[PDB]
Design a protein around this nucleic acid. Structure first.
Length: 90
DNA sequence: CGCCGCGTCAGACTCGTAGGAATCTAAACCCTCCCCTTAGGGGAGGGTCAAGGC
């Protein structure tokens, strides 16, 4: 699935997928070496689902690039919770 | 104007590897300019992919 079809699946911008492939989170399955076309798979839909689930929780993207591969990191969730509590009280 | 001692200037072998020279040293202010930070958006410029139309 090309980047337009996949972007239509997730209801997200093509620029979002470009940015994500740039920062390393959600790199596509197959990069066509001739023209650079990004092709995607449902395994990328499953990675993007949790990416969006964490993004909807307020985690910054560089927090996500640590949270989704170093799965055992647990202090960053009570940390984000105390940070949101301080922001809400303010 | 001529000659004599003095000031000055210019020259002085080709192969390998080692192989350089090593001291000394304002600070507190202000300014502009350039790049940087999210999480991507927007566009320009340039390519690429299947459709067919003759």
């Amino acid at each position: 699935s090309q980047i337009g079809l996949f972007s239509k699946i997730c209801r997200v911008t093509i620029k979002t997928l470009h940015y994500y492939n740039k920062i390393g989170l959600l790199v596509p399955a197959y990069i066509n070496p001739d023209n650079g076309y990004r092709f995607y798979t449902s395994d990328q839909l499953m990675k993007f689902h949790q990416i969006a689930s964490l993004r909807q929780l307020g985690f910054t993207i560089t927090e996500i690039v640590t949270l989704t591969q170093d799965e055992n990191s647990c202090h960053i969730i009570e940390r984000r919770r105390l940070e949101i509590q301080k922001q809400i009280r303010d």
